[PDB]
């Protein structure tokens, strides 16, 4: 219908509800996935209840979730398209960042080339649009920007006499406090010996701290400055009212956990790590002249941020606008590891990436032996691209099978030329909000069929 | 003959209908109306020659009900009805009572009739549906369908036959319909009216859909139309229950919700 018409941009209750829902998790065409999910949840819905009372929940929508993981990862593997470059050089317009964004774009590309996460599972994760901030200082004239692969704040050390600059720091991060915490028997009497019990809390914790040997010490919750003394005398520097966001952020970038009742951690894996904390000072009136702390070599390199400048407000935020134009083109180009050969020339071997990979390897179950048996029935849904384009001109099962054979030279059928072409230059292919269209379905789909 | 609330109807005709009085008269008066077999009844069902207007026969109770609702109905009209803001609700052109001693009519007998627009038009309707939205019961028509002619398909039939019901209405249009549905059902709910269904007519190709709420006059009647005939068995379905049935407010929500699925 309008979903087989999917070599072009030119376009179940709960299902389509969630359809719109994730459709503005990321914006794209509704009907394509409406109809795909229609058909495939139709076979599903035929599984569970009215007849056949199947065990319809485990091990099959499991298989779809796996299908969608492979979908994201591999379909983002096949760009050869005469990519945006012309589109983007054309995107140049719309503001006064002339002559001096190019660094910006080249090096945002660098940092977003830093990124190929494989974090949560057997999954090449991509937390794109989630994992960095860049920042300026309004002052002077802009063009002096200098990048650093790490954080830089204005969050002064817990004690200006603590580390003027730290290196290879391990730290201990806990959403809770260094202050005698909520023991079962809530009791408060004899102020002095109970502040002393707080002192002992602090100090045996400090035993266990230096047993961990942090380098910086940071709580989300609180501390008693007693412990602050206990470690600044040890030299384990400290930070204050410490922001939970980058806490979890970099603790995860580290190996440092946040073991929350360290009576738990009789051992290490709570300690974080990074490379070095280093200040830099400014000196002039008009209190832009501040001091700000480099925090570099964080245990994950998938993160950067820059010294930027500017002598105004409105053109500066307008350069921010170019920077978010770059935000958008970045993650757009990113859903593909930036395009795919259109006119069903990459997509045959794409839908078949499962096919030929898990066939030649075999080593094939990654789909399934039902992707052998049931893989004749439904992954045929991934086999829609051909069922869209070829059967119009050339070949229904034929290029499908003989091109999951693995030529690796992916020109394909000439619907509208009879000889050679691809929609790429024909400028006729739905842009790439459409990919995520396959990874949202099963999480929301496995419950409504209880 | 007796005409009820001549002034109000006249206003209704022009207002919502924007129907010229002369046109109205011509349709009814000029050519004899053609009869349509109605339901099992017993009550006459007619249509004008032009098929623009439908003349139905109503019971004394229903006619009285009409009078009670007329002020609200009128108000609803002003806020929104066909010329005003289009309402799915039936457009009542006129209500009359004919009882004539003369031989043609039964003597000392009262025949009450309601004239209204006809949702389908004269031209043609390929498929028809009567959607209650109610939980399974008479959600199918056995005898109907017998006619090679247009069958009045019911909810279950819509669900199975015109399953994955193809009614695709534009997104812009969906919003307008649903909004109007919500208001109508709310209006009906206020009145305690129930057991009304949505009549749907379909044209094929770039399709044209015809829809409107019908079976408006029936309210507060717990005891009515006891079921007849034997129920088919072999399948779980309607229960011996329920002494406790769905209320008017409940009916309204279900109606809209069900209708929501019908059009995409």
Radius of gyration of chain B: 19 Å
How many strands of chain A?
A: 11
CATH class of the largest domain in chain B equals Alpha Beta
Shape of chain B: globular
What profile does the largest beta sheet of chain A have? 4 strands, antiparallel
Count up the helices of chain A.
15
Determine the fraction of residues in helical runs of chain B and give it as a percent range. 25-40%
Order of helices and strands of chain B: EHHEEEHEEEEHHEEH
Helix content of chain A: 25-40%
How many distinct beta strands of chain B?
A: 10
Number of helices of chain B: 6
Write down the CATH topology of the largest domain in chain B.
Answer: Phosphatidylinositol Phosphate Kinase Iibeta, Chain: A, domain 2
Structural class, judged by helices and strands of chain B? alpha+beta
CATH architectural category of the largest domain in chain B: 2-Layer Sandwich
Largest interface: A-B, 5 and 4 residues
Explain what this protein looks like in three dimensions.
The complex is a heterodimer of chains A (450) and B (264). Chain A folds into 3 domains: 13-83 and 341-445; 85-149 and 301-335, 2-Layer Sandwich (GROEL, domain 2), CATH 3.30.260; 151-277, GroEL (3-Layer(bba) Sandwich). The two termini of chain A are 30 Å apart. Chain A is of the alpha/beta class. Chain A contains 15 helices and 11 strands. Chain A has helices at residues 13-23, 30-46, 61-75, 85-91, 102-111, 191-212, 225-232, 244-253, 314-335, 346-360, 384-388, 390-393, 398-403, 423-426, 441-445; strands at residues 137-138, 146-148, 150-153, 165-167, 171-174, 216-219, 237-239, 276-281, 291-296, 305-307, 309-310. In chain A, the strands form 4 sheets. Chain A has a 4-stranded antiparallel sheet with strand order 3-9-8-4, with no helix packed on it. In chain A, strands 5-6-7 form a 3-stranded parallel sheet, with helices on both faces. Chain A has a two-stranded parallel sheet with strand order 1-11. Helices cover 36% and strands 9% of the residues of chain A. With 264 residues, chain B is an alpha+beta fold. Chain B has 2 domains: 2-117, Phosphatidylinositol Phosphate Kinase II Beta; 127-262, Phosphatidylinositol Phosphate Kinase Iibeta, Chain: A, domain 2 (2-Layer Sandwich), CATH 3.30.810.10. In chain B, the strands form 2 sheets. A 6-stranded antiparallel sheet of chain B has the order 1-5-6-4-3-2. Chain B has a 4-stranded mixed sheet with strand order 8-7-9-10. Classes of the chains: A alpha/beta (450), B alpha+beta (264). At the A-B interface, loops of A face loops of B. It is classed as lipid binding protein. Keywords: Lipid kinase, Lipid phosphatase, protein complex, lipid binding protein. The assembly is dimeric. PIKfyve/Fig4/Vac14 complex centered on PIKfyve - map2. Chain A: 1-phosphatidylinositol 3-phosphate 5-kinase. Organism of A: Homo sapiens.
């Amino acid at each position: 219908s309008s979903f087989q018409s999917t070599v072009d941009s030119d376009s179940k209750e709960y299902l389509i509800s969630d359809t719109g829902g994730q459709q503005l998790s990321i914006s794209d065409a509704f009907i394509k996935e409406s109809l795909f999910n229609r058909r495939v949840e139709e076979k599903s819905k035929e599984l569970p209840f009215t007849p056949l009372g199947w065990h319809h929940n485990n091990l099959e929508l499991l298989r779809e979730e796996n299908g969608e993981k492979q979908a994201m990862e591999r379909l983002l593997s096949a760009n050869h398209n005469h990519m945006m470059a012309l589109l983007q050089q054309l995107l140049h317009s719309d503001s006064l960042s002339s002559s001096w964004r190019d660094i910006i774009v080249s090096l945002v590309c660098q940092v977003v080339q830093t990124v190929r996460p494989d974090v949560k599972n057997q999954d090449d994760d991509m937390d794109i649009r989630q994992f960095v901030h860049i920042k300026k200082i309004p002052g002077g004239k802009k063009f002096d920007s200098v990048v650093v692969n790490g954080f830089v704040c204005t969050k002064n050390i817990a004690h200006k006499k603590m580390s003027s600059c730290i290196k290879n720091p391990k730290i201990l991060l806990l959403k809770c406090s260094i202050e005698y915490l909520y023991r079962e028997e809530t009791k408060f009497t004899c102020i002095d010996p109970i502040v002393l019990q707080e002192r002992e809390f602090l100090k045996n914790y400090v035993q266990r701290i230096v047993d961990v040997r942090p380098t910086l010490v940071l709580v989300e919750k609180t501390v008693s400055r007693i412990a602050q003394d206990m470690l600044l005398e040890h030299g384990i520097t400290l930070v204050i009212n410490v922001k939970s966001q980058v806490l979890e952020r970099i603790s995860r970038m580290t190996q440092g956990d946040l073991v929350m009742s360290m009576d738990q951690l009789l051992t290490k894996p709570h300690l974080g790590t990074c490379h070095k904390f280093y200040m830099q000072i400014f000196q002039l009136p008009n209190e832009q002249t501040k001091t700000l702390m480099f925090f570099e070599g964080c245990p994950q390199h998938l993160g950067c941020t820059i010294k930027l400048r500017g002598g105004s407000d409105y053109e500066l935020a307008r350069v921010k606008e170019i920077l978010i134009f770059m935000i958008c083109v970045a993650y757009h180009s990113q859903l593909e590891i930036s395009f795919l050969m259109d006119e069903f020339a990459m997509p045959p071997t794409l839908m078949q990436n499962p096919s030929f990979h898990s066939l030649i390897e075999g080593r094939g179950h990654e789909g399934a032996v039902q992707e052998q048996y049931g893989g004749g029935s439904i992954p045929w849904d991934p086999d829609i691209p051909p069922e869209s384009l070829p059967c119009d001109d050339s070949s229904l099962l034929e290029l499908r099978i003989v091109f999951e054979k693995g030529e690796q030279e992916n020109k394909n059928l000439p619907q509208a030329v009879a000889s050679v072409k691809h929609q790429e230059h024909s400028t006729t292919a739905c842009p790439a909000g459409l990919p995520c269209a396959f990874f949202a379905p099963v999480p929301e789909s496995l419950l409504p069929l209880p | 003959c007796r005409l009820y609330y001549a002034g109000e109807f006249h206003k209704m005709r022009e207002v919502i209908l924007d129907s010229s009085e002369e046109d109205f008269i011509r349709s009814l008066s000029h050519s004899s109306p053609w009869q349509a077999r109605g339901g099992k009844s017993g009550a006459a069902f007619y249509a004008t020659e032009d098929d623009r207007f439908i003349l139905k026969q109503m019971p004394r109770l229903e006619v009285q009900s009409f009078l009670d609702f007329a002020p609200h109905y009128f108000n609803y009209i002003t806020n929104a009805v066909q010329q005003k803001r289009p309402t799915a609700l039936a457009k009542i052109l006129g209500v009359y009572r004919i009882g004539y001693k003369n031989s043609q009519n039964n003597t000392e007998k009262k025949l009450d009739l309601l004239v209204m627009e006809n949702l389908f038009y004269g031209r043609k309707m390929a498929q028809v549906f009567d959607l209650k939205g109610s939980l399974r019961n008479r959600n199918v028509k056995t005898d109907t369908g017998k006619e090679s002619c247009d069958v009045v398909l019911l909810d279950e039939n819509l669900l199975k036959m015109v399953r994955d019901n193809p009614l695709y209405i534009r997104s812009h249009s969906k919003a307008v319909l649903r909004t109007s549905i919500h208001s109508d059902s709310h209006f009906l709910s206020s009145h305690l009216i129930i057991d009304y269904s949505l009549l749907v007519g379909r044209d094929d190709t770039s399709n044209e859909l015809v829809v409107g709420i019908i079976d408006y006059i029936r309210t507060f009647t717990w005891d009515k139309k006891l079921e007849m005939v034997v129920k088919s068995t072999g399948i779980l379905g309607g229960q011996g229950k329920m002494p406790t049935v769905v209320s008017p407010e409940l009916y309204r929500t279900r109606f809209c919700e069900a209708m929501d699925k019908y059009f995409l």
